[PDB]
Amino acid sequence: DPFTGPHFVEYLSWEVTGECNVLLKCKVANIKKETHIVWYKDEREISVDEKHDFKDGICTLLITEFSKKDAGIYEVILKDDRGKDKSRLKLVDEAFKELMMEVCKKIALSATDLKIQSTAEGIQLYSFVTYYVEDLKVNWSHNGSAIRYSDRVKTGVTGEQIWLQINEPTPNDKGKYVMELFDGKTGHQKTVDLSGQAYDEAYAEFQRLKQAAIAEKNRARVLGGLPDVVTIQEGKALNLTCNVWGDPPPEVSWLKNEKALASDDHCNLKFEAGRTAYFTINGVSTADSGKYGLVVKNKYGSETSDFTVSVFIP
Amino acid sequence: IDPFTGPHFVEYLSWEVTGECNVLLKCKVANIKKETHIVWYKDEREISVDEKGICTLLITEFSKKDAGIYEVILKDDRGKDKSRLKLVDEAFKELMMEVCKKIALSATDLKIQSTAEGIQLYSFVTYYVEDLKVNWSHNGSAIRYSDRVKTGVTGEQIWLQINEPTPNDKGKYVMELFDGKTGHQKTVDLSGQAYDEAYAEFQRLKQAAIAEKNRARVLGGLPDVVTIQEGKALNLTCNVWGDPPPEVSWLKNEKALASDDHCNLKFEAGRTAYFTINGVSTADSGKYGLVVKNKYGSETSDFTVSVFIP
Amino acid sequence: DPFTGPHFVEYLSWEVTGECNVLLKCKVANIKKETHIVWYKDEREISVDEKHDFKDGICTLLITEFSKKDAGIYEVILKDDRGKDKSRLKLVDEAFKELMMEVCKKIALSATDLKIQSTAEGIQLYSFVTYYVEDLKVNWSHNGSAIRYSDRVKTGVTGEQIWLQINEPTPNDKGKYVMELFDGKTGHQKTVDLSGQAYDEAYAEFQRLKQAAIAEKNRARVLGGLPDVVTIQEGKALNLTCNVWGDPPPEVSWLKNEKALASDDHCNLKFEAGRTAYFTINGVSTADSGKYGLVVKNKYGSETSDFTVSVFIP
Amino acid sequence: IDPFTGPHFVEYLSWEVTGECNVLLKCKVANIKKETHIVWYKDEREISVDEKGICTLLITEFSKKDAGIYEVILKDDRGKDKSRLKLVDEAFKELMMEVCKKIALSATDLKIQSTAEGIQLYSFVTYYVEDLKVNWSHNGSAIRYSDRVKTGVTGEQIWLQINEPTPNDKGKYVMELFDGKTGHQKTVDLSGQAYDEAYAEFQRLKQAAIAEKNRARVLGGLPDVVTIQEGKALNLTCNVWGDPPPEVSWLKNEKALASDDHCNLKFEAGRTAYFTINGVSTADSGKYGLVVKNKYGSETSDFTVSVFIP
């Protein structure tokens, strides 16, 4: 401590870390309480937090989600009534390029071996990265050739997932699959073989999923509009309405007290477009009380809707 | 008695008109034995009383059908005797006008009555009208019967229907009952204070009937309480009616509630209200109310949505 | 037809028939319409129906449920203004006795072979008669000896059923069983052998019935007092009460929304004497809505009671 | 400024009483530099304002605790200077009575107020009472404070509570505020038309409070609608309350219904009503009603039994 004014001991630098963040660093010395430590991106100040505290000895600032944005010129400016010292560190063309391709190695190294997983769309080829795409151009090889990209087989990425998909796989689609993660200078590969065993077993649950999923879409279904209990004064009239759906249009059927129920002039059921069932009583008498159910069903499934008309005599 | 000399007819078949215009066939028989038969005959065909000088036959609600020849025959093993009461043509034309005499000669004083439709004159015959001549005259003049002024007679009662009465319908109406060459009649003067009240009322019942027939009523379709589990959708409806067609509004807890996109109310062609919550939350539970009204009156239909959480 | 006055052609007599009724009869001749046919028991007139009709030729009157009551002196009296004829037929001591023992033969002849049937009380020995006991004294033989009557083995009759019962049968009770129907002069027998096969199989369903019937008596049981749905304004308090029973006293358990429910200060359950469960909410809040169940159970059985507190906010 | 001559105190620590009885510690400093420190001290211990000739320290809700010795020290590298404001013993006995002077000298005119419990006199001090001498005198006489006549002071407010007032409590009350050798007081005459209204009301609130506390209320236990299937048995209950204990009755559809053996009502110890249908038929469904009432008031609890057939 003098005075002559604070000063750096180590100048600005960068390293990569853990979840592939760029951490900047520098050591500083000769630091009064009342000293100022302030960072700047492109002369525009980074207004994170307090510039009225410090001790020793290292000074960091962490860049997150790092990418082309966090490029440009960074500087840490130490000051206080005694003096000022700048340490400037510059991240642009051919400085930055060195950095990007430097993150990716670390990204690329965290790339869980290629694994096989099927979905209702096809079979799918994914590897995990810890963690994340950027300027890490990406490529795939089926048996030593590029892959012609289509609507049946696509590539893509998702958060920390790198995937190849394969809608409507078939035997022609078995073979050797490889990943080319390209940082800028180097390349990196990871592989897997979609064949026999594994495959027969993926195309297995694939089929499963699709059949079940086609099914869980057009199964008949009561959408809503009945209550669970209605309670009505004897003699009054009653209108319930209930929307259904299915594809094919469904067959509705009514049930009072667990046996079938006939439409009729006094207890009239309608059905329409295969969209709307219409329960209706032109004067609820005690004998019209009990427990009703509506039951839609088509080829992919059934489903019922259960209500209770209880009645009181005024 | 004594064999022989067959049971005699001391007096032959004569009649009379007794009580509520019942005809009585009378006769006085003698020398009867408990082994004697008493049969009655209308136009050669057996009429049975109970089980066969006090023999009688009662004719109820006398008419043109009860006409024909009557005989009451008396016979056993000792002797047979016949009497006849012949009733066709002239001898019957005098029976009708005599059963009528008794009729006309007994009907309450004309009375006035207002109906929802008009003004009514009427008399009660403690008897029957079958083919009795009707005379309704207005001010000493035959009444022009139209689609406004009808006369008639319905079960025990005669009348004159004066639909939509003006004061022009005011005056001395007559009701002549005509039985042969005889005329017993009943008059009554529609004027002044009598009418002041009659017409007075008649209007009340009219205006009032107009209303109890167009005041917007709520027809039917709503429950009194629905219970639904949180999250499902509810679909009540309810037909209304009025003339002029009513205007509807709703309320959720005594406070007027307007339609949204979530709890939707509609109302089409003025005869149906659709109430439609769309994913009933607890918030949507409550005491709802549907009020229709028009110029003639109003009405509210209430229900309560309750909800449990599953 | 004269006249000299009606008269009998055959005098009063009796025969037995079908469902062992005594029918009386007689032929009559010379009958005007207006004639009188009237029957009398002990000079006291039988006032059945019309005495002002007749033709030819037979005249009957049927005694039903026949027994010691319908004894005494019967007479048919024809009259009308011409004359009178009586035919008298007398049914007392040694006339009647002849009749009683005469019905029974016909009763006894209709006696469906002895059959084996077990109940929850024991095994039971019954034969059917078409149809009915009276002065037909009845007796039983187990292996050629009278049967000592007790509280474990009783005799009896029921409408048209003649039975021997056998509470708590055991092997000592197998053997030859025979029926002695005794009219007055003769005797009649019908038999069956409670042994091996049949028996092992009766004592079978016997055991069944008793176990199941002991059970269907002390199984726990909700007797009543809950509704199926209650609907209450938010904030209000709620008292439900529900009586149960079992022997042994039962264990009650509550369930809200299909999992267990804890008594507590705000949702307090009691139970008492093993007779009365006590559901209670000191301010029903929406979160107290849902579907509850009460479930009593002891060693012989379970049983639940299901209700729903739905709530509306004023 | 200019090295050296350390930042000087032109005027030493003096005080004043400003605003809502806040005390101000004043001083006039000179020759300060932006590199100068300004620390405040109460009894040798650091008090921190914000972040260290206009220096000030605010004392909120002044009391006996804010007592002790004060110092405000000025120092940098050029020179250090101290001032002291000593506050213990006599010098502090004059601060209390001066903060009090400002207090007493500003309170609204006595006002009168009726509570459900009695009659209230009160004044609002736009300030604070900590240890301020209270003088309530009734007719120029010290008031005998008992279990009926309390004095006191609650947050910003002074008062005199006259429970169950008679006219004997009528007269010229005094409220002397005593700050040292000074006395500012407030009088007010409880008599005549002022009292006529005050007491007037006080009773209303009393009688009325008696009632809203014993009128038979229905406590809780009944549903608003029960639904049960035909034939099962129903067991509602409901605790009530009142003083004198209420009498209960029931109704089934606006018509008073009496207990039977089938649909049984009981009511024991006057705090619980048991309603108990025993095999609910359709006939037993309906709109039931439980009415309790006593001399102070009444209440009804409604519910509806509805039934379906299974």
Residue numbers in the entry:
A (entry chain B), C (entry chain B): 1353 to 1666
B (entry chain A), D (entry chain A): 1352 to 1403, 1409 to 1666
Could you give the paper's own sentences about this structure?
Members of the myomesin protein family function as molecular bridges that connect major filament systems in the central M-band of muscle sarcomeres, which is a central locus of passive stress sensing. To unravel the mechanism of molecular elasticity in such filament-connecting proteins, we have determined the overall architecture of the complete C-terminal immunoglobulin domain array of myomesin by X-ray crystallography, electron microscopy, solution X-ray scattering, and atomic force microscopy. Our data reveal a dimeric tail-to-tail filament structure of about 360 Å in length, which is folded into an irregular superhelical coil arrangement of almost identical α-helix/domain modules. The myomesin filament can be stretched to about 2.5-fold its original length by reversible unfolding of these linkers, a mechanism that to our knowledge has not been observed previously.
First, we determined the overall architecture of the complete myomesin domain array, including Ig domains My9–My10–My11–My12–My13, from crystal structures of a total of three filament fragments: the My9–My11 triplet, determined at 2.5 Å resolution; the My10–My11 doublet, at 1.9 Å resolution; and the homodimeric My11–My13 triplet at 3.5 Å resolution. As the available independent structures of helix-connected Ig domain doublets show only limited variation in terms of domain/domain arrangements, a reliable overall structural model of the complete C-terminal myomesin Ig domain array My9–My13 can be generated. This reveals a tail-to-tail filament structure with an overall length of 360 Å and a pronounced zigzag-type arrangement within the central, C-terminal myomesin dimerization module (My13), followed by a superhelical coil arrangement towards the two symmetrical distal ends. The right-handed superhelix is defined by almost constant twist angles of neighboring My domains of 26–27°, except the arrangement of My12–My13, which has an average twist angle of 68° and thus appears to be less regular than preceding parts My9–My10–My11–My12 of the filament. Because of the smaller length of their linkers, My9–My10 and My11–My12 show limited direct interactions in their respective Ig doublets, whereas in the other two doublets, My10–My11 and My12–My13, the neighboring My domains are too far away from each other to form an interface. The complete filament structure of the My9–My13 dimer therefore is defined by an arrangement of nine rigid bodies, comprising eight Ig domains and the central My13 dimer. Although the precise orientation of different filament parts of myomesin in the sarcomere is unknown, available experimental data lead to a model in which the dimeric link via the C-terminal My13 domain in myomesin filaments is across the central M-line.
